[PDB]
């Protein structure tokens, strides 16, 4: 029984340390209401389309009915009076967020044939390490530390979803990717949003090279007309 | 052992393949998608800088 | 034999130094040239700033 | 031992000074050829410039 | 008449450089005593 966080466009991605930082300070109170309790929480829920924070504290239908139910960890408050560190633990979908009623459907369903299913897990890290290659957003030691080799994996689908954390799709491609059930579906899905990234980066490449050697060509030209007009100086 | 190991390569490139024919149809599937949703994503992309 | 071929290769080192030297040396003349216009541009901004 | 070190360096020196003075020689020899030839090549370059 | 190594999920194929870092320090005493 807490009211639903305004997320105000902080999408906290499922294992994946996040920090929070309303500008309203109402949030605050909550805070510091829930300081007293022994075991303070808070949950993190996704925006719909159109934000608008007077939607969320007047009706309660505009968040999405999937939640990240998550354990507190410790305040900073460096600057501002709310700089909450959020994380995603314990994923969750209510059937009715008006009505609170809450239930772990954190679905993990596995083939009893577990040889050929690691396979795609090749081209999942291939794919994960060509994107922080190419196109470095966070650091590749994170990597190293988690290897497949390592066996460290127990739970493949946190590596699919923080793998997917690298990717700058859209929050409401990422709440689809929440809404698929079936496991080669959500996978392919965040394979597909791993290319939709990796072919507007490998264009930006193409177009840089390409505005660049265009420079070149205009300046080294100019030095061959350069080269010409001292080579032939006093003779005109 | 040599035997092994060629039924071993044989079993792991078929592994390798078939991820790389299924991939193919998959990726095939993503090409599916309209190469104006490809144009769709350049318009959006000269909208960028002020304007 | 020997000397001459090595002579010959002993003379296209040498025009050829001397027309990287002259090429190098005239690109170094045009950064003199764009370099101090820089300076006196940051003359121009230090002046615009505060003179 | 240092004297015949010595006299190895001798007929090295020797051997080095006949190769200079020989090759100060051919390239005398290789220097008669014209200045013209020279600023020929330089009319050359001129005509072959900018691409 | 050595302690096992922990192999600890490392590979080492036959004639194949591999590097290995085993998270407990106790094998870092047999490193020294070796010397």
Same mark, same amino acid.
Do not use: F, T, Y
């Given at each position: 029984h807490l009211p639903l966080i305004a997320i105000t466009r902080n999408p906290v991605f499922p294992r994946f340390i996040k920090i929070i930082e309303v500008k309203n300070k109402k949030l605050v109170e909550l805070l510091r209401r829930? !300081?007293? #309790?022994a075991q303070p929480y808070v949950g993190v829920f996704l925006k719909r389309d *159109? &934000?608008? /924070? &007077? *939607? !969320? !504290? /007047?009706? #309660?239908d505009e968040i999405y009915h999937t939640g990240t139910f998550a354990q507190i960890h410790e305040m900073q408050d460096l600057g501002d009076k709310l700089r909450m560190i959020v994380m995603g633990h314990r994923r969750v979908h209510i059937s009715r967020q008006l009505e609170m009623v809450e239930v772990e459907n954190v679905v993990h369903e596995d083939f009893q044939v577990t040889e050929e299913v690691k396979a795609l897990t090749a081209e999942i890290v291939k794919t994960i390490r060509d994107i922080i290659a190419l196109n470095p957003l966070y650091r590749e030691s994170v990597l190293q530390m988690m290897q497949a080799g390592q066996r460290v994996v127990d739970n493949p689908i946190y590596l &699919? *979803?923080?793998?997917?954390a690298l990717t700058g799709a859209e929050s409401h491609e990422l709440q689809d990717v929440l809404e698929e059930t079936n496991i080669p579906k959500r996978l392919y899905k965040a394979l597909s949003l791993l290319k939709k990234e990796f072919e507007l980066s490998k264009l930006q490449q193409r177009l840089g090279r390409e505005v660049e050697e265009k420079i070149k060509q205009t300046h080294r030209k100019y030095l061959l007309q350069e080269q010409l007009k001292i080579i032939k100086k006093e003779l005109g």
């Open positions: 829930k !300081v007293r #309790l *159109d &934000s608008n /924070e &007077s *939607d !969320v !504290v /007047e009706s #309660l &699919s *979803d923080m793998g997917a």
